[PDB]
Amino acid sequence: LEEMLTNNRIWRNRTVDIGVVTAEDALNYGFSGVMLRGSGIQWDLRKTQPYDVYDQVEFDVPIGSRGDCYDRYLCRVEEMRQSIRIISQCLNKMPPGEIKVDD
């Protein structure tokens, strides 16, 4: 897919500067997601407030400095790749404990 796109003059030149966002503006409008990712303002819930063993596994989140809606695309991509990392390590770490709680 990354050869299917990403240096395509068409897709790029259609989405480059369209719909940018200022970081603080995104904060006031409350955007949470690939928005904040691709536009500055480095933040994640996965990293900051781990809600389960998802804390342990290693991986790294992308960002972008152009806030350009192209950055957000590429950030989604790289999150797919990192998702592959997390899936891998998860397959390596799986304990054979049990399914449901015992209560």
């Binding site: 790749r81 592959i84 891998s88």
Partner: protein
């Protein structure tokens, strides 16, 4: 008995996440060099063929003018 939960002998072998998009080496300016080269061939050959066609032109007009009387 024993337990049938999944995990096998560790690691499942390695896995490759990272991005790879390599290999195009034909591109220096030299792409221009081969294209412009192709032009430089076209004008050569086409030059020749147009000269020949002029030669034929004169020959045909010679047919007509010899006919005229």
């Amino acid at each position: 008995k024993v337990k049938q939960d999944m995990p096998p002998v560790g690691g499942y072998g390695p896995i490759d996440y990272k991005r790879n998009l390599p290999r195009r080496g034909l591109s220096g300016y030299s792409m221009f060099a081969v294209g412009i080269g192709a032009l430089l061939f076209g004008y050569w050959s086409m030059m020749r063929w147009n000269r020949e066609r002029r030669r034929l032109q004169i020959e045909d007009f010679e047919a007509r003018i010899a006919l005229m009387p």
